[PDB]
Nucleic acid binder design. Structure first.
Ligand SMILES: [Mg+2]
Length: 529
RNA sequence: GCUGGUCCGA
RNA sequence: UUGACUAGCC
RNA sequence: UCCGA
């Protein structure tokens, strides 16, 4: 009895034809939320992968778990546990469409909390448009009109003014489009002004409010909207700098000619929101606004390493990782990556995760480096082995008693250590992918060598394909031969529906890579909590 | 007063 | 933007 | 496709 044979009737064949278990639908939902389906996997094509997860979603709704789905989507969104928004928004769109009335109602109820910025709302609505044929249903019923109307009417006019000028339109939709389709009725004078600005433009608003009496709050909105117009009618460096300071305008408010100015950037740097700062490190370095040993460089490092703000702004470790890698590249533009910035990014990476108190148990961390793990993740340049290595570094730095190992169809030494800097672990890992997949190795190896481990964490895509015993079986053998209640945590690295964890074994757990809140689930499972 | 749906955006 | 239609609710 | 702590 080996992997090419089913262990029981509950097992199904994976992409290689070997037998594993079907991961639960709620668990597959989480994998989807964290990895999406873009780029598909080594075995499944993008489109097919998308349909598979969409199928699982519909199955959840059909099984009457639609409200649990929405709750899970909302939780991931609010806590920022997922690197990208597309998957959560696509899922919310499905739930808001054709689902049972309860599911649909919970979904729209979650719109304000899930769609925080215009880009989210625009993307959500576009997916509902794409789902319009496949789900045989229209989208502009009273519920969507109401949800969109509330999105605008429950917001402070001045804040909305910032939102509609910074994000005029994204992913196919503009605010004008939404107002036209929602037929919103402004809830106050500030909203009416903004609605008028979005629908007819500045000139219209100006003529509409001339000789008109306005509260002091409305006056603020008018002045702000005017500033966004004024900044586009001048090439004077100082006037722009003063408007930025005065109205806290951001990069999105400026013209191309303005972004060539080192001084405009320095003033832009003053109150640059966190994500924008992270993504423009390369640009500002090339322009010398982030000069070596400068005062800006030092300021930037302090912002990137402040755990409180990283959480507040919902900065995800994967964003940190991607930024780190491209910044280190030194080209995108050409620049000398600042070593202090590079060190701060490494530091922020770990801080971006939801940290927890250590358990003090013995962990054996095994990274799957088989050929399939060369698959790209989240449309980035980083493969699954690289991403999993980053997760291992996280766990290894949380649990002092951690041992890292690698494997394909044979055990291999791990070329990374707990003291390395992230960019270094990345370089040491993108040449390792090779060979077949034997997911039972870690447990078999530990037994053979008498290595004591309380927890086995295996980072893989669960596409095991060697004529060796089932990993579940290897785990059972380890428990008996070593006299240790070892547990296996399967850290999924894709959104396929396969798992080597035995559903009937309370000692085996399914979770997925780069869920910024995964360290919490691991701690609870480990401590039997 | 309210909430489901069809149409109306680009 | 500040709907049309339709189905229904208090 | 740039989440104002
Ligand atoms: Mg493989």
């Amino acid at each position: 009895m080996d992997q090419t044979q089913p262990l029981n009737e509950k097992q199904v064949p994976n992409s290689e034809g070997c037998y594993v278990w079907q991961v639960s639908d709620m668990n597959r939902l989480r994998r989807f939320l964290c990895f999406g389906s873009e780029g598909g996997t080594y075995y499944i094509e993008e489109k097919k992968l998308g349909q598979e997860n969409a199928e699982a979603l519909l199955r959840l709704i059909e099984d009457g778990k639609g409200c649990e789905v929405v709750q899970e989507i909302k939780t991931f969104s609010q806590e920022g546990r997922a690197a990208k928004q597309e998957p959560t928004l696509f899922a919310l769109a499905v739930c808001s469409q054709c689902s049972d009335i309860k599911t649909k109602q919970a979904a729209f109820r979650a719109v304000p909390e899930v769609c925080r910025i215009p880009t989210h709302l625009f993307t959500f609505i576009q997916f509902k448009k794409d789902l319009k044929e496949g789900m045989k249903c229209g989208m502009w019923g009273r519920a969507l009109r109401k949800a969109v109307s509330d999105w605008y009417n429950t917001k402070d006019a001045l804040n909305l003014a910032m939102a509609v000028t910074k994000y005029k339109q994204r992913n196919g939709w503009s605010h004008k489009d939404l107002l036209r389709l929602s037929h919103i009725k402004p809830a106050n004078e500030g909203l009416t002004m903004v609605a008028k600005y979005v629908s007819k433009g500045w000139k219209e608003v100006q003529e509409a409010y001339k000789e008109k009496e306005l509260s002091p709050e409305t006056e603020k909105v008018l002045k702000y909207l005017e500033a966004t117009e004024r900044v586009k009618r001048t090439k004077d460096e100082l006037e722009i700098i003063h408007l930025i300071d005065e109205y806290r305008l951001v990069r999105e408010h400026l013209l191309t000619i303005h972004l060539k100015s080192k001084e405009i950037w320095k003033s832009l740097l003053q109150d640059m929101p966190l994500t924008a700062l992270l993504r423009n490190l390369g640009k500002m370095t090339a322009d010398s606004v982030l000069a070596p040993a400068s005062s800006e460089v030092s300021s930037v490092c302090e912002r990137l390493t402040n755990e409180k703000l990283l959480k507040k702004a919902r900065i995800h470790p994967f964003h940190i990782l991607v930024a780190l890698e491209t910044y280190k590249k030194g080209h995108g533009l050409r620049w000398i990556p600042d070593t202090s910035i590079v060190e701060a990014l490494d530091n922020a990476f770990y801080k971006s995760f939801k940290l927890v108190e250590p358990t003090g148990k013995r962990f054996l961390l095994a990274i799957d480096v088989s050929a399939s793990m060369n698959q790209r993740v989240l449309g980035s340049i980083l493969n699954a082995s690289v991403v999993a290595a980053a997760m291992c570094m996280l766990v290894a730095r949380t649990e002092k008693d951690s041992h890292m190992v690698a494997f394909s169809d044979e055990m291999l030494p791990c070329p990374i250590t707990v003291n390395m800097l992230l960019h270094e672990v990345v370089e040491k890992m993108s040449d390792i992918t090779m060979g077949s997949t034997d997911c039972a190795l870690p447990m078999l190896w530990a037994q053979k060598t008498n290595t004591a481990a309380d927890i086995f964490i295996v980072f893989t895509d669960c596409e095991t394909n060697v004529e060796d015993v089932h990993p579940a079986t290897a785990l059972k053998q380890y428990r008996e031969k070593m006299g240790i209640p070892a547990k296996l945590i399967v850290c999924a690295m894709t959104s396929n529906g396969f798992s080597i964890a035995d559903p009937d074994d309370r000692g085996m757990l399914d979770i997925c890579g780069f869920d910024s809140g995964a360290l919490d689930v691991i701690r609870n499972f480990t401590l039997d909590l």
